């Protein structure tokens, strides 16, 4: 409705304020993910032979068979959150 937008123009910069606040929230979410996860500038890889003195990390290391390259625990976490 164009005359509704003409009436909405009389109320000023309310829509600009709401859009700016939501843009700040949207960039803050990506920022928060950057301080949580992007803490190293080098992408490290485990050796092909995964023997660590008897310590087993297969449930937390990535699964090469899965296309998502996620750990079994991470795959369970992703399946249990909808």
């Amino acid at each position: 409705s164009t005359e509704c937008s003409n009436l909405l123009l009389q109320y000023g910069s309310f829509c600009t304020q709401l859009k700016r606040a939501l843009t700040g929230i949207a960039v803050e979410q990506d920022k928060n993910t950057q301080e949580v996860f992007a803490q190293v500038k080098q992408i490290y890889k485990t050796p092909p032979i995964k023997y660590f003195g008897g310590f087993n990390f297969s449930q937390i290391l990535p699964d090469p068979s899965k296309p998502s390259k996620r750990s079994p625990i991470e795959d369970l976490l992703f399946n249990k959150v909808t």
């Binding site: 709401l18 979410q29 928060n32």
Partner: protein
Amino acid sequence: ALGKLQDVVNHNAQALNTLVKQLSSKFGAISSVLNDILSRLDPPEAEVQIDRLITGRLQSLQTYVTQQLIRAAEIRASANLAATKMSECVLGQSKRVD
């Protein structure tokens, strides 16, 4: 066990659903549909009816944005805590109890 993340998702979905539900509110006007108010009314009090719908929808949108800002502050505090735990528990061994 995974309630917290699910709660975050639920809160976001619930807030969005509530905001869409606020488009069905008359807000003391004759209808919640702008085109109906156009069709059954001449302009000079249809201006008042549409103005009532506009101020109701602004109230709903500002309520949603304020709730989103408060939840964003809470999630930012949780994420700052998570970054601190990533630095201090994963990237090192911590002497801080619990």
